[PDB]
Amino acid sequence: MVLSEGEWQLVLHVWAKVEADVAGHGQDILIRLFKSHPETLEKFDRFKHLKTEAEMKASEDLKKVGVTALTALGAILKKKGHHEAELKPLAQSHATKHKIPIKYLEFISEAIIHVLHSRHPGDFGADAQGAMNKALELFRKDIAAKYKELGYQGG
Ligand code: HEM
């Protein structure tokens, strides 16, 4: 839904590339996020002592956190927009417990795009980038509506 079937096929095609190495993609996405938008690191109490990129890559804790996030995102993307049941628990924890503004979901979306183009340019051209941008936009729009439903504007 929302996206065309062709757009969803592009999203799931590049996501299959991510699934060949979820841990490595998650590490690189979090490292890119923290370098581009350093304020986001303040949400991760157990990563504050990780001062260098090599320390971040060596942290099993960071790797596990990245796999958990990418696993949840992949499950959502595979619903092709039919993801209300998957977004409700994610909104609850990120609005009320971790306190993640929607802007930080934009920041991580940028990092996802960057890493996927860096690793898979032959499978992530302009049409695929646009499709993934629309899929992440839909995810962010719908989770922002769930934030509000819970009483959080997410600004
Ligand atoms: C694609 C976007 C994201 C997805 C799919 C995602 C998914 C998840 C999942 C599944 C968990 C574990 C269960 C839970 O607590 O809900 C989690 C935990 C967490 N998330 Fe996210 N997340 C995303 C973005 C972010 C961003 C951008 C931040 C902060 C800048 C963030 C901060 C956290 C924190 C601090 C935890 C707890 C980590 C721990 O101590 O184990 N998340 N996330």
- Could you tell me the distance, in angstroms and rounded to a whole number, from the CA of residue 155 to the centre of ligand 1? 17
Sign of CA dihedral 59, 61, 63, 65: negative
- Could you tell me the distance, in angstroms and rounded to a whole number, from the CA of residue 68 to the centre of ligand 1? 8
- Could you tell me the distance, in angstroms and rounded to a whole number, from the CA of residue 120 to the centre of ligand 1? 24
Rounded CA separation 132/125 (Å): 11
Residue partners of 94: CB distance under 8 A and separation at least 6: 100, 143, 147
88 lines ligand 1 (CB under 6 A): no
Query: CB atoms < 10 A from the CB of 129, how many?
Result: 15
Domain that holds residue 118: 1-155
Residue for token digits 């936009």?
137
Residues 110, 36 contacting (CB under 8 angstroms): yes
67 lines ligand 1 (CB under 6 A): no
Domain total of the chain: 1
* 136 class by beta-carbon count within 10 Å (0-12 exposed, 13-18 middle, 19+ buried): buried
HSE, side-chain direction, 13 A CA sphere, residue 98? 18
Cα angle 16, 78, 13 (rounded to 5 degrees) comes to 30
Ligand 1 atom at minimal distance to the Cα of residue 70: 5
Ligand 1 atom 43 nearest Cα: 69
Rounded CA separation 62/52 (Å): 13
- Could you tell me the distance, in angstroms and rounded to a whole number, from the CA of residue 94 to the centre of ligand 1? 7
Ligand 1 atom 14 nearest Cα: 93
97: domain CATH number is 1.10.490.10
Rounded CA separation 123/111 (Å): 17
Rounded CA separation 141/19 (Å): 25
Burial 96-121 (b: 16+ CB within 10 A, else e): eeeebbbebbebbbbbbbebbbebbe
The secondary structure of the chain, three-state, reads: CCCCHHHHHHHHHHHHHHCCCHHHHHHHHHHHHHHHCHHHHHHCHHHCCCCCHHHHHHCHHHHHHHHHHHHHHHHHHHCCCCCHHHHHHHHHHHHHHCCCCHHHHHHHHHHHHHHHHHHCHHHCCHHHHHHHHHHHHHHHHHHHHHHHHCCCCCC
Rounded CA separation 128/126 (Å): 5
Rounded CA separation 108/31 (Å): 10
